[PDB]
Design a protein around this ligand. Structure first.
Ligand code: AKG
Ligand code: AKG
Lengths: 299, 304, 303, 302
């Protein structure tokens, strides 16, 4: 019974609705003898008579009544799918999956929550993790878009930069250098310093810049957590270098401050990426556009 | 619209998704791979979204594809159902029983169901053996006349009752040092090489809870999702395990297995049969329900 | 034997394993991709087993690689520890406080620890911030002077004591129709956008439970394992969530966040300071422990 | 710090142990002035004196004393990794990961069980799953060996066949055709038959052979489960075709039997595969050799 055609079902259902081959033909802009043979073929496939002529009309047999609701269910299901596809296309349904490097937690979720108010039907997933996780997900095509800091050479990606990630010297509001301008980088000599964990991107960049300019800091502490570091600074433990976006909620009157040391900010970027040769969904390309938009004139 | 799709196109798509391969699909359907290729391109144009993405040497379903695949499986199911009604008409069948049972009831239901049709050749049967999730799915859609579960879901308005006990027992190979001994305390399982079921499993839960309650530390040698695989692993002397005693129904004259007589075993579970939200039952459904209740009333577990 | 190996070799290896890439490792170590490659194979012969395997464009660490990686990390830690004793000797310091604390305590311990240091300038400090499991290993290895945990482990013999409350609260944006309202029924939450923590977490469990133990069905809009990310999600209007009130300490003057006074909240949790049972506290430990207790005794939670 | 070499620590540790440069240099088959200059360089990088001479002997400074303990730990940790590498090479420790296609559940776990008895140090994972799951594992390199019916072309694999998977017609012991021989395949026409699920491997291989010999069976039931089917057979609901390894536990006095039909068994195979280019661990190669051996002689059940 898979040998039946959709077209033969479409003829059958019309022929049952109306009571005649001819009325059906007129609806389906085909010929009455095409309808009759289509029905004979379909009855041969089913194995039973579908119709009985009584007076001027074709009435359904038991097997025909069953096939009618079978046809109605099937056509219902296709319509339903057609509705899905239409909602997808007009960004009123669908799924957006983002995997994002850790440092981007300070903007991405907020952007993403703005975007959903503007497209409520969308369902979202956000994964916030490290470079190794992200590489794995990329290898398995798990998300629509990936936001990273350093696009992995060994994976075919389509990407571009969209937002600068300055690393800046952060201090407590009462530090001597606070408010001072054009401060030479040698001024960091002998300063209590809170270092990020070994093997961190941030650590490595901070150390490289410090080796280049002969600066020797007193490492008071080593932590793995930017929040922890901000807190340690507040507590007087020292200064550090962190991504400026860690300062997003800080206002006019803050316990923290940026120092204005020369050779800073250490300049780094965030990229958007998708796998090379990927079919970008409607909402993905929509989101991509909205992203580049809101982060172009973003301080 | 979407009535421009053909049933052949959906067959080709549904087999491609299933196999993850134009080649394997073409083999199944007795067609050339370019036929597969162009049928998919055509259908894909008709829908107006991509259904597949080929990233490297790997084929993936898009969102729209994932959604069409469910649509194809519903449609095909409905055509199977119609084919069955037709056979039932042709054979002047009195009507058809619809049963969905939890996985572990495959070791008593099918056989029992054979012996039930013996008594009424006027009746036909559609047995679905599946997990709890799929049973709850079928339950929301009124898909079946009776449901057999280990744990009736709290989401649904059911009319359930228990009918057969499901004792979980310790199983070893006939040559195990504790084999044929009596009244062994549960502490003797300390350090035994043990084969655990997979993580989400309620069998695993029941066992992990009971062992935690008795401060029993076993050496987990293996995790397996399959009862049959476990039984085979026990036969090869990998260790012992805890399984539903009914899994021994399929254990023949060549079997090396035995039940160790451990204190606080069996873990007592049972099976429930369930109607749905006070909806009345056919004469068939009730003739079967009475059958179930009779035959199982005093049915001994295997290896008694 | 393995004394044939070189520390530079081990340093090249560990960077390769860490990066998943000879090129990215080569950039970090200020050297050449051929030299990384060279130095790894030189090391591989010495070991007697392959340390990596390349399938397609993917670089995988072998079983011997994975073992070597752990060995390299232990070794490098010991060298870093030696360098700290040296800087302590040469800095003519009074001594060093070692402290390991549960992840959620980063929102008070590091600040407090600064202030303590300002009070005792001869003391150096090591602050490890990590999860519960890892605090157990560290406990078993007598690694630290004091441990701060959300629940003391049963398998370890510990003197302990609670010192600060950990209220979990409902957090929302200040434009929310429930902002500024008193004595709100818990049932007001149901059918509301909600950001849920990751599966099998202290926090998610403790709110799924209290939502079924007071009959509340919520619309889960997102899943995140980062507290900061959730707060950012709330600022963007994504929904509400339940977080430790202490996560609000880093919420500056531009914050658009608030706590909703929902009935049957706060969910109440605690922090405990613990040491190994019977084991004498150093003068330094003791001085800190006293400072801790004083400062936290009447410490109000943020907002 | 970390400009220090490992040989500098080794020379340092000998020097502390003997209390002289000379006795240390004799142990390391090097000269006395290499030792001195080595220690002096190390003393520079450390930033403090490591030794002081008291009387006839070099004694450790405070820094020296700490350096000695950190050296003994480093050397210790380094020897441990060598014990592991040695244990691995001689199969006394290590990991074997197998992922197998569903139907191999009736034999792989048993063999694996027998194998582990010989090598008790080894940890094992066995994953029993479908072709799609197996492909994902193959793509992410999650296991040592894969056991499959049909290796997927789009993945680079070294593979070889090792055991036949005959599909045979199965009935209840009282079936009319039981005991018979050279039964015509057309005997099955009109016969009550229990089919495997749509899209199965087995259902396809069965529907090929039936369309080819114009065979029309009375499909009484469809089921997803080999165990269920065997039970349904036993309950009188029909006959079916299943892999012969389903019958592994059945002895001479079984409620089941195999019907000796023309064009049967449908011959299918199992293969062992690993990814191409990948080099097999020592325990993996061991297992492979063992698998081929025990299967070479192996008869199907009954
Ligand atoms: O940056 C930190 O320390 C916080 C770590 C984090 O992901 C968070 O709590 O969101
Ligand atoms: O074969 C069946 O019906 C299911 C068998 C099973 O689930 C198992 O292989 O463990």
């Amino acid at each position: 019974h898979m040998q039946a055609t959709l077209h033969q079902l479409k003829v059958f259902e019309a022929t049952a609705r109306h009571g005649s081959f001819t009325r059906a033909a007129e609806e389906l802009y085909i010929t009455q003898p095409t309808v009759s043979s289509q029905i004979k073929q379909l009855s041969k496939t089913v194995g039973l008579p579908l119709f009985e002529q009584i007076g001027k009309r074709l009435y359904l047999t038991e097997a025909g009544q069953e096939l009618l609701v079978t046809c109605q269910d099937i056509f219902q299901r296709l319509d339903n799918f057609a509705m899905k596809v239409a909602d997808i296309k007009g960004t009123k349904q669908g799924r957006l999956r983002l995997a994002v490097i850790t440092t981007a937690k300070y903007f991405i979720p907020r952007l993403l929550g703005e975007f959903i108010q503007k497209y409520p039907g969308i369902e979202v997933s956000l994964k916030v993790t490290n470079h190794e996780q992200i590489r794995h997900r990329m290898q398995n095509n798990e998300d629509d878009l990936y936001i990273v800091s350093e696009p992995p050479e060994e994976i075919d990606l389509n990407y571009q930069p969209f937002l600068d990630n300055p690393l800046v010297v952060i201090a407590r509001r009462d530090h001597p250098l606070a408010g001072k301008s054009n401060i030479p980088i040698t001024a960091l000599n002998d300063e209590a310093f809170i270092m990020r964990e070994k093997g961190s991107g941030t650590r490595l960049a901070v150390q490289n810049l410090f080796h280049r300019h002969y600066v020797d800091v007193r490492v008071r502490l080593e932590l793995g957590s930017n929040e922890a570091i901000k807190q340690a600074i507040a507590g007087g433990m020292g200064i550090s270098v962190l991504s400026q976006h860690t300062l997003v909620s800080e206002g006019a009157r803050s316990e923290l401050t940026i120092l204005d040391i020369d050779e800073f900010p250490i300049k780094r970027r965030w990229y958007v990426a998708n796998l090379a040769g990927k079919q970008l969904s409607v909402i993905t390309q929509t989101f991509l556009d909205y992203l580049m938009a809101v982060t172009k004139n973003m301080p």
